[PDB]
Each structure stands twice: as C-alpha cells, then as structure tokens.
C-alpha cells in the first residue's frame, strides 16, 4: 500500500533520470575520439623495488613531493620510503595489524591508516622529539575502514564497511559530517583536486558524488555489475574512473551524469583492485587480481601496456603528482616503482 | 656538502632494517588464527575458555605462539573483510550442531563459500562441531526429527570409520556423524590437495579445544613442508 506506492514513485524517478540521461547521450566518447592519434606502446620498466614488508601490502599513497611514499602491510607496519634512494624513513608499528588503508597528508606532517579495527589512526611525522607517535584515533565507524584521505592536517574523509563515509575534525576527534547513501561496504574514495567534492564506490555496484561542505549526495552513478573496489578522479575534477569485480573499468562524467566509457577485455575475467590516472588523464592505470596492471587509453578504450612484475594480487597503485612515476603494491609484500 | 644528508638517511635505514629483522622473527614464529564461528554457535564461550572492530587472543601451547582473532562489530557481509585472512594458519569454523530445529544449513552455505573462495583456497579449516551435549539431548528426546531439515538422513548409516564414544547410544552417533559428513562432502568435493578440513566434535567447555588446534596446526605446517619438497 504505502510502501509499495513509494516503490512505484521511485520507479517513475529512476526512469525519468534514465530518460534525462538518454537525452544527453547524443554521441559516445569513442566516436568523439575515433580520430585522435593513439598513444602507441606504453611500456614501463621497474625502476625501484621496495622489500621491507613481511605480509601482504594492502594500500599505499604518494606524498605531494612525488618522492616520499607510505605503504601499509598486514604485518602491522607503516613504512615511509624514499623512492629515489629506496631508503626507509620511518617504520611505524601498528596497534592493529589488520590495516586496509593508508594516507599521506599533503603537508607531509601526518600519515593515517585503518582497517579491521574500525579506527583511523593519525601519526605525527614531524614531532619535536624525533620519533613517530599516534596523534589521534578516530573511533566512530561501526565497520572496517577501507579508505581515508586527508583534506588538510585537520580534516580527513574516511570510508568504511558500515556503508558510510565520514568527515573528521582531527583536533577534536569527532565526525563533522556523515555520508549515508550507500547500501554496501564503501571500498574506496577519491577527493576532487579542489577538495570541495569527493566520490566513493561501494559494494552496491554504485558510485556517489558527495558535497563535502554540505554533506549531501549530489549524484549517483550506476552501470557496474558487481562491487566497486577502486575509484579515482580525473585530473580536472569533472570525471572519475571506477574498478569493479565485474572485470571492467568505467569512466563517468560528472556534468553528463552518466557513464562515458568501459575498459574491459574478454580474456580479463578478474576484478580490478586499484585505479589511477596519469598526469594528463590520457592513461588509466588499473591493477587486477591476476597479478598484473593494465595501462588503458582513457580516450580510446585501448590497452596500451601491461605492468607484469608482481608475484601476487596487485592490491594498490598510485601515480605521483608530477606524473614521473607510478607505484604498485601487491600481496607479494613488494612495492615496484614504474617509469 | 649535500653528500652528508645521504649518509644521515642511510644511517636511519640500517637502524630500521635491524628493527625489522627483530620483528620478522616474532612475526614468522607466531601462527595467526581466524575464529569464524556463527552466532550462538558457542564461539563466544570458546574464547572465554582462554565496539572494537576485531578482538585478539594470545595463548601458547608447548612454547608455540598463537594469535587468534575474532571478528566483532562487523556487518554480516563478509566477502570483503574475510579476504584479509588469506594467509592465516587455519580458520577455526565453529558450528552449533544442535542448532537445527535452519541454522545448520546456513553454516553449511558459509563453509561452502569459504572453502571455494578464490583467496581462501590455500587456507585450511579447523571445524568445531560444537554443542555435542545439546545435540545428544535432542536425539534422545521426541519429535526432533532431524530428517525434516535433512531428508537424506533417513537412508544414512553410521560409517565404519566412526569411533563412537563409550556409553552413548548409536542414535546420537548416527546424528553427529551425519552432520560431520555434510561438511566433509563440501571439503572433499573441491579440495585440490592445497587445504584440508579438520572436523572435531567439541563442547564449549572442552579443554581439548586448545590442544586440538595445536595438533591440527602441526599437521597443516607438516603438509606445507611436504608440499615445498613435492612429496605430498
């Protein structure tokens, strides 16, 4: 009766959105880019190999200097590397070894990490003493933490398995905002370049654009068939890419409010664990369960290269802010810097 | 000269590498266990025998270190966070054998997904068929009718390999062994010699549980070594 009529009202709204999206698809991205010159063979080489971790690596993040990077492994260690010289700068032991995400603050003064403990632990790197200690523990999520990203030294957005995202005040330690749209575990999040918006992918096969300062869900993007494991903004902040367990990557435009391109191959039947764009946005790098990373042409849906060094599941990857290199973490406990 | 800053950085490096070597010794010696009992399966009181997203428990047996983890305060959707335990020594799967009126079928479907998961195919499972004292009381009592929830139980007989407890009537032996072969039918259907299921008839207050895990973990590591030499 009442709930069923609300189920019919939602039916007439998704179809109206479907009609409004169908009316904007006057052309396809492949047809707009059919004339451009392809990129050719993008063959990168492993320039560095980082061999400190014991257990599988779950996450990694580049510092804004494009030189220092932090990685998180299930052995209960945060290691900060000097990618240029392969020297380790810090080896932070974790209270909970089941870490699933790690973040590097843009200022470089803090790193964050979290996992099955449901806590986002903030670590001060530049204390006057010299060592690394826990500065803050954020304890509001009722499920494991899947991703976290600093907005600044005082703000950080976290996504959790409790189907919610949250914006934290690091000094007080309380959630300033909570984002409650997803149905399943939120697996990843990506901040816009201006940090005014962020997007997240969840296990409900959907991605949602969130207004940070307002706390609402601007848009919701469908098209994937299974859980979205990774998400990354386009370098201009007007598009983003998602990687799913359906063995596909998909590009979504914010202003078009619909999918623009699908990156898949028939012999690719494993899920995508991580995605990241190049500095120009022409290349879409995706990590896969088959131990490899495939370089895609974001404009032509072509496969232009493969990174096949790792011996186990590629769990994470990231491109430097200057675009000089891309790092890849894996379940083999190794980080490879490719150029 | 800026060459001294490199000497200061490689100084902190070997300072870290010598600390990671001490952590590599503790990590490689401790055997991690995932306790994945169902609700009201007696999993809570097995830990008791001895808000947070996960609980830990340390215990030594013959000076061997064990770190058992119990997932608490996580949603009922496990297909993501259960992948974090792909490299544990064994998953301890606790089942309330007397939970059938269908809790037992749900435990079977969960065991099926764990056994056939892509990332847990090399992880062994120590199966604790818990609540044996409550199971026997239902079989001796009236109109329990195990055959309703499992019709194939009518044409099932106690196997010869069964070692029945002295004193208990064969009606309970037939019941608890039928439940055991329900899980063995799943484990022996897809096991490619990589992982094995170790079933045990346990109660929540059994002091044998800690020794049972120790003996099965020893068999797991022995088979891992026999697998490195291509002997088994």
């Amino acid at each position, epitope marked *: 009766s009442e709930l069923d009529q609300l189920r019919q009202e939602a039916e007439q709204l998704k179809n109206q959105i479907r009609d409004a999206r169908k009316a904007c698809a006057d052309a396809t991205l492949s047809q707009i880019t059919n004339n451009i010159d392809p990129v050719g063979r993008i063959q990168m080489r492993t320039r560095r190999t980082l061999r400190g971790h014991l257990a599988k690596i779950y996450a990694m993040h580049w510092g804004t200097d494009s030189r220092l990077l932090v990685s998180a492994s299930q052995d209960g260690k945060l290691i900060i590397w000097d990618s240029y010289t392969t020297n380790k700068v810090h080896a932070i032991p974790l209270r909970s070894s089941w870490v699933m995400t790690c973040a590097y603050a843009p200022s470089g003064n803090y790193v964050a990490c979290g996992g099955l403990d449901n806590i986002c632990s903030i670590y001060n790197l530049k204390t006057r003493e010299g060592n690394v200690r826990v500065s803050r523990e954020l304890a509001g999520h009722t499920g494991y933490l899947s991703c976290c990203r600093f907005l600044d030294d005082n703000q950080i957005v976290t996504s959790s398995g409790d189907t919610t995202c949250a914006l934290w005040d690091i000094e007080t330690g309380q959630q300033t905002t909570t984002f409650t749209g997803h149905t399943g575990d939120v697996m990843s999040l990506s901040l816009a370049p201006d940090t005014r918006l962020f997007v997240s992918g969840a296990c409900d096969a959907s991605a949602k654009l969130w207004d940070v300062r307002e706390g609402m869900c601007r848009q919701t993007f*469908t098209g994937h068939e*299974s859980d979205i494991n990774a998400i990354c903004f386009f370098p201009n902040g007007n598009a983003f890419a998602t990687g799913s*367990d359906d063995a596909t990557c998909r590009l979504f435009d914010l202003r078009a409010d619909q999918e623009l391109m699908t990156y898949s191959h028939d012999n690719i*039947i494993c899920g995508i664990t991580s995605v990241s764009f190049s500095k120009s946005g022409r290349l879409l790098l995706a990590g896969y369960d088959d131990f490899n990373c495939n370089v895609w042409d974001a404009l032509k849906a072509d496969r232009a290269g493969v990174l096949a060094g790792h011996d186990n599941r590629v769990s994470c990857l990231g491109v430097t802010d200057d675009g000089m290199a891309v790092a890849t973490g894996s379940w083999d406990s190794f980080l490879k810097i490719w150029n | 000269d800026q060459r001294n800053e490199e000497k200061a950085q490689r100084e902190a490096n070997k300072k870290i590498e010598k600390q990671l070597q001490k952590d590599k010794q503790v990590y490689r010696a401790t055997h991690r266990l995932l306790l994945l009992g169902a609700g009201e399966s007696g999993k809570n009181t097995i830990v008791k025998q001895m808000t947070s997203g996960i609980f830990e428990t340390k215990f030594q047996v013959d000076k061997v270190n064990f770190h058992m983890f119990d997932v608490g305060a996580q949603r009922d959707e496990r297909r993501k966070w259960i992948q974090c335990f792909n490299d544990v020594t064994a998953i301890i799967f606790v089942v309330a054998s007397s939970s059938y009126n*269908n809790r037992l*079928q749900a435990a079977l479907k969960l065991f*099926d997904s764990i056994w056939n998961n892509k990332w847990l195919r090399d992880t062994s499972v120590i199966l604790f068929l818990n609540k044996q004292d409550l199971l026997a009381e239902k079989v001796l009592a009236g109109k329990s009718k195990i055959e309703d929830y499992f019709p194939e139980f009518a044409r099932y007989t106690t196997p010869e390999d069964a070692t029945p407890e002295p004193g208990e009537d064969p009606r309970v032996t037939r019941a608890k062994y039928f439940i055991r072969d329900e899980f063995l039918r799943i484990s022996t259907a897809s096991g490619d010699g990589r992982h094995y299921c170790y079933p045990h008839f346990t109660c929540s207050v059994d002091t044998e549980n800690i020794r049972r895990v120790f003996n099965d973990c020893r068999d797991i590591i022995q088979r891992m070594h026999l697998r490195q030499y291509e002997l088994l």
Partner: nanobody
Amino acid sequence: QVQLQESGGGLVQPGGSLRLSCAASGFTFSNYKMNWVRQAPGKGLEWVSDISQSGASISYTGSVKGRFTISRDNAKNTLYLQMNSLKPEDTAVYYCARCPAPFTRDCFDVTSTTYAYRGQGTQVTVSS
C-alpha cells in the same frame, strides 16, 4: 543498474503448486550463480535453492528437496522456481538473489540483511 524483480505468488491451498519468476536486468545473467532465499514471518532470511551459471549444478535446502524445482533461462535472463505440493510452512517472501561476483564458485552474503544484489521479493502465502 542491477535490478531483480520477482513475479508470481499469492494465496495457495495447502498442497497446491505455484511458479515464481525472476526478471533479471543490468548484468550478464549467464555469468552469475543465482539463488532463491526466503524470509518467513518473524524468521530471518534462509537460503532455499541455488543454480550454477550453466544450469547443470543445482542444490536445494532439505526442507524443500523433492517439492521445489529451480531453473533458469539464460537467453531470457529469467530465474524460475516451480513450487509443488506447498505446505503452510512455506509461507514467506521469496527473494531472487544474484551471487556477488561473476565466474566464482563461492557465493557470499546472499542471505544477509542488507544484501544489494537481491530483489524486493514476492509474497507467497500457503493457508486454507
């Protein structure tokens, strides 16, 4: 957009028959294992039957084996459930649940409280 809509269901006499249908859209139907789950009044969700992607492997829960028949038409993107000789204990809302990932042998979370890849269910009442 993954959508599962179950058809059929209603009032049946104790001992009668019925056929449930599941109209699937938004995914490659022939890549996923399909399930039927149900929620009796006051009871939790319980798994009823599953069928593999090819349709050759079929499993049933013990309470319905011999009476219920599951089937799928990969060309029509439909999952069927033929329920013969219904009992009063079969009164429940029957849900069509898709397995979370394609090309997988395992099937997690299909009976969870807030599983995403599941329909809204159709009501089946068996009472004279």
